[PDB]
Amino acid sequence: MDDKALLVEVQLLESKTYHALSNLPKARAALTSARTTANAIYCPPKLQATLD
Amino acid sequence: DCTFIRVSGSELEGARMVRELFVMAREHAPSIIFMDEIDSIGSS
Amino acid sequence: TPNCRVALRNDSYTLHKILPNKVDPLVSLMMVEKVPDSTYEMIGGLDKQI
Amino acid sequence: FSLTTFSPSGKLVQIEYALAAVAGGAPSVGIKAANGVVLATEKKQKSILYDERSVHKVEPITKHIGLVYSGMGPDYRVLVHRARKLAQQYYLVYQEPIPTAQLVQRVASVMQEYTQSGGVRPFGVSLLICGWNEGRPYLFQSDPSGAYFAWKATAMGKNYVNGKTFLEKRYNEDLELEDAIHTAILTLKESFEGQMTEDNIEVGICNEAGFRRLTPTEVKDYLAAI
Amino acid sequence: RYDSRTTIFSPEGRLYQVEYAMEAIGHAGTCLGILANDGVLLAAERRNIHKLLDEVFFSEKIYKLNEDMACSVAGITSDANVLTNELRLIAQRYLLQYQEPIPCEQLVTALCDIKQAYTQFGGKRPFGVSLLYIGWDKHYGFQLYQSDPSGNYGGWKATCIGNNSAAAVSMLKQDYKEGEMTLKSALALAIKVLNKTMDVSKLSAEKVEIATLTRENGKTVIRVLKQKEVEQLIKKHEEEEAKAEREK
Amino acid sequence: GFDRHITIFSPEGRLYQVEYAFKAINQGGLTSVAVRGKDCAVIVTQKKVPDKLLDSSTVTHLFKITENIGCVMTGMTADSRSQVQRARYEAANWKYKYGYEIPVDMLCKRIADISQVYTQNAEMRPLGCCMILIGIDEEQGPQVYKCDPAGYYCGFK
Amino acid sequence: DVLPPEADSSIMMLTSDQKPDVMYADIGGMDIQKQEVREAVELPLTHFELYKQIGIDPPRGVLMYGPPGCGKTMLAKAVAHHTTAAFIRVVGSEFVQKYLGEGPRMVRDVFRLAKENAPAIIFIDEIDAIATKRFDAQTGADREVQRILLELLNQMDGFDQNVNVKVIMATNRADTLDPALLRPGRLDRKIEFPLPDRRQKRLIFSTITSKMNLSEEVDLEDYVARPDKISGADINSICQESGMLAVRENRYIVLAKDFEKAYKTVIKKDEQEHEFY
Amino acid sequence: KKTKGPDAASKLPLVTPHTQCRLKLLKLERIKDYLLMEEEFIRNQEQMKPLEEKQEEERSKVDDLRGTPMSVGTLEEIIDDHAIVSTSVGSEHYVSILSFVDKDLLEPGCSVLLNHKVHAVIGVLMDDTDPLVTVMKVEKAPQETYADIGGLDNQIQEIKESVELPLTHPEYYEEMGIKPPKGVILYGPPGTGKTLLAKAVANQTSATFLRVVGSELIQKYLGDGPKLVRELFRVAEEHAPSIVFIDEIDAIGTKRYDSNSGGEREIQRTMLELLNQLDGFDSRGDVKVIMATNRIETLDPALIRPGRIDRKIEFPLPDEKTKKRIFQIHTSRMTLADDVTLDDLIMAKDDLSGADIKAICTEAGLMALRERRMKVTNEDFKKSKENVLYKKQEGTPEGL
Amino acid sequence: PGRIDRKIEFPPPNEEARLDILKIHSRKMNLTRGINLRKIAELMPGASGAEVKGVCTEAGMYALRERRVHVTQEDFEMAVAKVMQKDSEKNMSIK
């Protein structure tokens, strides 16, 4: 599909759980994908803070 | 077993140049000399 | 043998040895190509044309 | 010369340039749902100096025919004024047919003074028209030179390509109720750069009851919970 | 200096603008008309079949232009719309004047006269559209006519006007048989030639639009074959293809 | 060519004639401001008077279009006067055709339509003068609008 | 004797490897495409074994015919560090000089430096205006440039996918380029890196102004919403220059005035979208 | 830099049958026996030497003084005793050469040797083999003869008279004191024009021939299209007086455009220079210029005038007998059939030219060789007509 | 002369020709056991052998990101999507 908010939230949660399990490189890859997806939403004030 | 001499034709003077490949550069009597799309328009 | 390379001398420039080809390796590829394979078996769909 | 002109060997170069201009940048999606049609568009005014209740992108040409457009708003006005006069003339001649959807196809066809008589310079706007006075809805597109296209869902903006891709992927579908306007707003979201709000987004709906340009109250209501 | 259009000759003496428009008519669109006893039919190729259309106009290429005829354009839709409107207006004006349906040849001559005028005088573009007509009259019965943007119409009985019109007409010449031709075998021939000229085999009934004109009891009936009938024709053609291929 | 010489669409998909005509407004050396308020609408432009042999009494760039609508022009003064005359004619003709006075938004819409006709066709040329017209409208408060050589009429506060 | 080193023979840059200058995701240009560039790094990112077996033929030549927008070198300074690989500036303008006889030799030497390190990428700059323009006739040393390009073609053909090194040219306009490099079989992947793309431009502004931690502690009332929605080109290079134009050290922070001055300097007035909309 | 070339080839083209038979075989045997005997004679003359005289006086005096190392450089100027030569890398030597000094072959602008050390000229390379700047005499005196083209007897007689006013009976208009280089202006359908070349080969049986086809609308600032052809027919006067065949260019390069000024310069330069060279009052020479074309209408008034450019000749389409003759010529090499299907292919034919005749003759052989390979393919009788249709005559929409 | 010998023209490949070109280009590569390459080519509207090559390399690249020797039909259809990105952009459809 082409949902974007759900994709950003899913990727951020995946990065969070990689960090919780100390999976740093996969966490970094997932976070980069999260940025690439999150370019779409222009002012998601909560979501941008979550990404940062 | 002739050649694969491939010249586009869109190279820019058009004189000379081709003379070498026409006779001397060939490097082989058998010669297919394939020219690409003829960039020279009708009446040029 | 013409169209090959040779070694010469310093002042009199007399021949030393008829060297193998040097012109061909240097400028082999200018705008031409020698024979590739690209056999007609790879050519397909155009049999009625070939 | 003084018509839709400049057609070379197998081309309509002036028309093609007009379409390049109608590429525009106002997304202006349209969706034909079972109950009715939604024409949503983006009103991204430069700065806060401009107003949003002053000028509109969605125009009710008649009782249940609503209209949205693309680039060249100055041309779009004139076009919508002509369309209103045409629908009114048809209604006056064929008196009292409450003509909207048996008139939506007809007004799309009379959108030939639209372009087949270009006027030296062809119009630079592609417009979506919605009607529901037949028991069934109708969404048509008229482009700076072509004719009625009879869409089910499309967009006419700067990112109309991926907008249409989004529409088909999100399955414009056929069972969708009238509240496919949520999907329309989603499609805009894709071709939108900002936290869209009630004045930022203008949408009209044409259902079997009639046509209506949704006020900022309802637009904000729909934008909430997205 | 001001721009002036080109409605002029060639140093040789050719109207190359008109010739370019006529050749461009081959580009885009595909229609074909086959004439047969007790029924003459048109087949059209649905160029754009995007799933986001609704098909509510009920007809894009085939246009009903009169009680006793129907046409099919293959040109720029902008000119096609106005030309069909003028054609219907001409036919109905004749009906008003003579209280009798207009003969197909007279209708086609009027239309080609208007196109000849458009290419003749003034700084006006030629009507870049070529169209077929199928009709029935009292004098000549079933008739088929093909008009090019040059205004030089021709009375055909099996022709095509689209992109691969050359291939379609070659197929028609190869598998056309006059006299024996009937409505059903005419339909088989039409679907066969359309399958030939449309590269994708097993043409969907949505990508093909066909309309048949038939003569009922003292009345002309122009029926646009709907999806089910078209695909049943497709199935019968497919059975014939499989049988012919396997019997070798 | 002549894409940039006549009012025709550019191959890139733009209209260069009106794009030029907008810069004609900047040409002429003047500026004008309009501010809508809580209840009033006030506009102001500088009065560039070179040498005092002129009549400062009549060098103005603001005019009454009707009894309640006031306009400020910006750009070439000849086109500015022509459009002011056209706006006054439109206001009077509107008051004649329909009893009530012409709303400022409607007047700006008609002026914009005239300008849009000008940018259409090729015989005439757009007028290089952007007009800011203001007026009090009932049930609306003060209202300010701007018609431009293109035909886009809007502008507020 | 034979001198082992080859890069410093004519300078022309050297081993930009083993050094994070701009990593990868830190770029402000997001993608433009960058997927064809990850495709181009697939060969440095091993995957030469996976090029076979699967039966694919990995690309070899990547020309980017874009203006200075996106940097056009933030992809080669990166990638080379994303997957550790040598990076060379080459610089076409410097190469065309009196050392046209040594031009062939320096091409051989740099090709040898690349072959020495299978993780290496050649990056050639400023081809369009000087190196082998095809529409203006040969003026004097232009034949020398053409011979140098011929030797470059000879070297790229002798490479013939012998190792996993990669070659990328960066050009503003590929029209004047010679067909020999342009034809498939020598260089295939053409990528265009367009202008800042106003949404992507705002993204670039955020990325750069964050690079220098919030523009070195910028004040809150500075937001780029106003100076970014200009529709005034302002390539990523100009964006970086504006970001560094916070060098006004009268105070320890940055205000919106600094951004306004940065946008005011070096700019061309382009406006008037309301007619089109 | 070029005077003549050694013509010791083209061994007796007159092989009478040109088809495999006893007569042709015997002619070839005599030819090869002559070759054998000539090789044997020269080899015996060179081997069984008349006398052994020292080092042929070569290595004794001149070879050693010439020396082992040498370098090649152009010879620039000439003085009474010394010679002024421009050797390599822009060197210049004024030295007298007395060993292997052949003054006639030396010439300015020719490659000579330099013995190094004490740099003085010691020899010349008369071969050189690089006179390639403008080459138009490479095809000089074409071997094509009258018999190659038939059925054009009137035109052949006319052109033969127009070009045999010189050579033959020059004293005629020498006593008449006119010496007219009028040239010949040739008409003809576009379907021919290489037929104009063929009728020019009749003259080309005598002296050389130069060709300028299409050239250009001499945008060149120096102009010098006609001026360089003037230099080249001066070169032809130095050689055997050659003709200049400017078919087509006399039409485009010299077009009767009603435009006066602001027009490609050729109208200024080219036509004026053409007239200047075509008037015998300016340039001498037995050079005869053949201005052929396929558009008589575009004849410029200057070219129109028989006063300077006389001998207007019209090339018409072939008649029935001319078609028979040309088809006989073209199919004679290929033994079309044993039924000799000759008149059926031309009796109803109209507007068929030499190029079409050659094309149909070639395509008949092509189609036979395709699969119908039967030597004198019996199918040829009707396949000559089959590829005589071949469509391709003309196609332009319908317009009718 | 030099062209009157022949004027042979190239017809764009039909659906079956495109199937044959698919076979030629995919004999070398590895893929799944089952594939309806005839339908795969027929899905491509017209195009050319260059486009068949593009589809083959796109299938290879798409299978690369999954890192498997068996190019699936889904990856193949993703490669068919390389015939897309051209379309007609805007629905001109003026004919």
Ligand SMILES: Nc1ncnc2c1ncn2[C@@H]1O[C@H](COP(=O)(O)OP(=O)(O)O)[C@@H](O)[C@H]1O
């Ligand atoms: N994050 C970034 N994204 C894009 N561009 C950047 C970024 N950071 C810096 N740049 C700029 O990119 C520029 C590269 O420009 P340059 O190499 O001159 O262009 P070209 O490669 O076309 O010659 C640098 O000058 C730098 O200022």
Ligand SMILES: Nc1ncnc2c1ncn2[C@@H]1O[C@H](COP(=O)(O)OP(=O)(O)O)[C@@H](O)[C@H]1O
């Ligand atoms: N009447 C003829 N007899 C013999 N050969 C001819 C005749 N006419 C033409 N040819 C040959 O055919 C060739 C083509 O002649 P022509 O028709 O003039 O060609 P084009 O139309 O291209 O000028 C000429 O080179 C000539 O050798």
